[PDB]
Amino acid sequence: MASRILLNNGAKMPILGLGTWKSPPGQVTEAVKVAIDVGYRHIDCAHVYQNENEVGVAIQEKLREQVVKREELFIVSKLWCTYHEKGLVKGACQKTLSDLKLDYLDLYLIHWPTGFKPGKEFFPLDESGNVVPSDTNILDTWAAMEELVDEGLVKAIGISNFNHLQVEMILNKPGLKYKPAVNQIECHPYLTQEKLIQYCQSKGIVVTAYSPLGSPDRPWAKPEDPSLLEDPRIKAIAAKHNKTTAQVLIRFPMQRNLVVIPKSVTPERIAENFKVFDFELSSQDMTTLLSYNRNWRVCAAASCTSHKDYPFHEEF
Numbered sequence: 001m002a003s004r005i006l007l008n009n010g011a012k013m014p015i016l017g018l019g020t021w022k023s024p025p026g027q028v029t030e031a032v033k034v035a036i037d038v039g040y041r042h043i044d045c046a047h048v049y050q051n052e053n054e055v056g057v058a059i060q061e062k063l064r065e066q067v068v069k070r071e072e073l074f075i076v077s078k079l080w081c082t083y084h085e086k087g088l089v090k091g092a093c094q095k096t097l098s099d100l101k102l103d104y105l106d107l108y109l110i111h112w113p114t115g116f117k118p119g120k121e122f123f124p125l126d127e128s129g130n131v132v133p134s135d136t137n138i139l140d141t142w143a144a145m146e147e148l149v150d151e152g153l154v155k156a157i158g159i160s161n162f163n164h165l166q167v168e169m170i171l172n173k174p175g176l177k178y179k180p181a182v183n184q185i186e187c188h189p190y191l192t193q194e195k196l197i198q199y200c201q202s203k204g205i206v207v208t209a210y211s212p213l214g215s216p217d218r219p220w221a222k223p224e225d226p227s228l229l230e231d232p233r234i235k236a237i238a239a240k241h242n243k244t245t246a247q248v249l250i251r252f253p254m255q256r257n258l259v260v261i262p263k264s265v266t267p268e269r270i271a272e273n274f275k276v277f278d279f280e281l282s283s284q285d286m287t288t289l290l291s292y293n294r295n296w297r298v299c300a301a302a303s304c305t306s307h308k309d310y311p312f313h314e315e316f
């Protein structure tokens, strides 16, 4: 299986990347250094993760060391919700570029379809706890993203957490100049996303699967929650293939023609998670893993469920 997938901007994207949400700032520099040393060439970042400076230190040190050339790296970041206004998009991108110590991003995503009021707070709230929306609409934010391509700041633009009607809205934008290259969505055996994936792929949009291990370190995890890494049925598939459960969970989206971005700050796991190019799940394995779907979604914000662009009211 080829290690990169061709995007609709003509560039190739590594199908395995390193996630960085929740990677502590005092550990993420070493995590990214180790990842690059063991073969990762794609890093998934975001301004809201509050660790792009430290990610950037690692990237810059490996470029300076000539462990890797810039053209071999595929660096992704995301425009946070408080920067959807057209006049804020460029500065938000520039802050990410400055922090990552780069002069372009390979891919820049609208992080969520919901725009929030600009200001210092990433989740501006009213006095009852609802997020304060922006009166920005995704189409104007998209035009601002297109301008980043034309200014040389980013090679590709895309979207994240867009439902199929929101994807369709952009694809139907009057005067659309660049199609989204990627839609990055939650996807794993408990949230298999068949409908949304088929739609995006049929339009030439590459899907990236986030939280492929079920995000066991998410801050709102409960003790009774489903656990992919502990599911005996998945452990059994892993044992049959002489692989770890995490390796099965990473290989699964790869065989659906998805990109996948498991997060770790543990050096041994960073290396383990990359050793997924030397085995194949059978069709039966794939269909069996798909059968575990329960529509169990771990990444959503209750504060956003009344936002006009909240993405998860729709079936898909």
Ligand SMILES: NC(=O)c1ccc[n+]([C@@H]2O[C@H](COP(=O)([O-])OP(=O)(O)OC[C@H]3O[C@@H](n4cnc5c(N)ncnc54)[C@H](OP(=O)(O)O)[C@@H]3O)[C@@H](O)[C@H]2O)c1
Pocket: 018, 019, 020, 021, 022, 044, 045, 111, 160, 161, 184, 185, 209, 210, 211, 212, 213, 214, 215, 216, 217, 229, 244, 246, 247, 261, 262, 263, 264, 265, 266, 269, 270, 272, 273, 299
């Ligand atoms: N676009 C979006 O809205 C969005 C939302 C969520 C996530 N994402 C992206 O997707 C990335 C991945 O998702 P995620 O961080 O939610 O969770 P994840 O990758 O599903 O799971 C990460 C957790 O799994 C553990 N882990 C990693 N490899 C393991 C292994 N081999 N064995 C056992 N445990 C292992 C990690 O522990 P250690 O780190 O302690 O090793 C960490 O607790 C994020 O970091 C972020 O880059 C994007």
Ligand SMILES: O=C(O)COc1cc(F)ccc1C(=O)NCc1cccc([N+](=O)[O-])c1
Pocket: 021, 046, 048, 049, 050, 081, 112, 114, 299, 300, 301, 304, 307, 309, 310, 311
């Ligand atoms: O959004 C991510 O990539 C991961 O989740 C977060 C990471 C952060 F650093 C900070 C916050 C979140 C978070 O709450 N993310 C969830 C979220 C955000 C925005 C809008 C919605 N929504 O449902 O409309 C949901």
